[PDB]
Design a protein around this ligand. Sequence first.
Ligand code: B8V
Length: 219
Amino acid sequence: ILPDSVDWREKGCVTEVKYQGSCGASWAFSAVGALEAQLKLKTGKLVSLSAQNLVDCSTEKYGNKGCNGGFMTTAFQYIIDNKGIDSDASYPYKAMDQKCQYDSKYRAATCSKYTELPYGREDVLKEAVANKGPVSVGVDARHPSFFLYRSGVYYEPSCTQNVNHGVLVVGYGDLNGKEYWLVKNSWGHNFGEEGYIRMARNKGNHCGIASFPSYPEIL
Ligand SMILES: COc1ccccc1C1CCN(C[C@H](O)Cn2nc(-c3ccc(C(F)(F)F)c(SCCN4CCCCC4)c3)c3c2CCNC3)CC1
C-alpha cells in the first residue's frame, strides 16, 4: 500500500534549502516548506513562500514570538485567517523581527486547513508523507551530534521526544537496513547533506520527530 521510499524533492515539490541565521524562525521555514509542496501539487508552480511574512505577522495572537520561536500550526492558522501568504521574492527574509508588511497584491499561496497528527505515531506520519506530502515537524535538536551531523542516519541515544526546532519531513527511506526520515532543515546548505538530515525512523519517536507533526492543505 505505501511505497518503501519517498522523496518529494524528486517530485519538484521542494524549494532550495534556506538559511535562518541567528533568527529562531525554524517554525516559519518549516511551515512555508510544507505549504510550498501543496502549492506545487495543486498549481504545478514551485515558489518559495515568505517565512518573513510569518515572522512579522503570525505573532502574539498566534502564540508566536518571531525570532524567539513559534509554531507551525498557528503559522498555518495565520495564513488561513489572512487569506494568503506572500512569495519569498516579494517579502524577503531579513532574519529579524519587523512590522507586518503583508500585501495581498503579492499573495503566492493560500491555506484552507491544516491537520495535526497523533503524538509519536510514526506509522501515521509515514502515511501522511506518502499520501499528502511533506509534513512539518518538531525535533529535539539541542545536541552537538545533531548540528554537527554530516551524513548517514542520525541516531542520538540522549535525544528526547521534547521538540525545540522546526523542520520539514520531505520523505523517508532506508540506508542499509536503518530506516530514516528525510528532513529539510533551515540551516543552509553547509548543514548535513546539502541542508538535509536523515533521522532515525521507527526507533521510538526518536528526537520527537513524530511528537507534533502537521501539514496544510489548499482548496
Ligand atoms: C499560547 O498558545 C496560543 C495562543 C493563541 C493561539 C494559539 C496558541 C497555541 C496553543 C498551543 N499550540 C501547540 C500545542 O502546545 C502543542 N505543542 N506544540 C509544540 C511545539 C511544536 C513544534 C515546535 C517547533 F520546534 F517545531 F517549532 C515547538 S518548539 C517550542 C515553540 N515555542 C518556543 C518559544 C515560545 C513560543 C514557541 C513546539 C509543543 C506542544 C506542547 C508541548 N510542548 C511542545 C501552540 C500555541
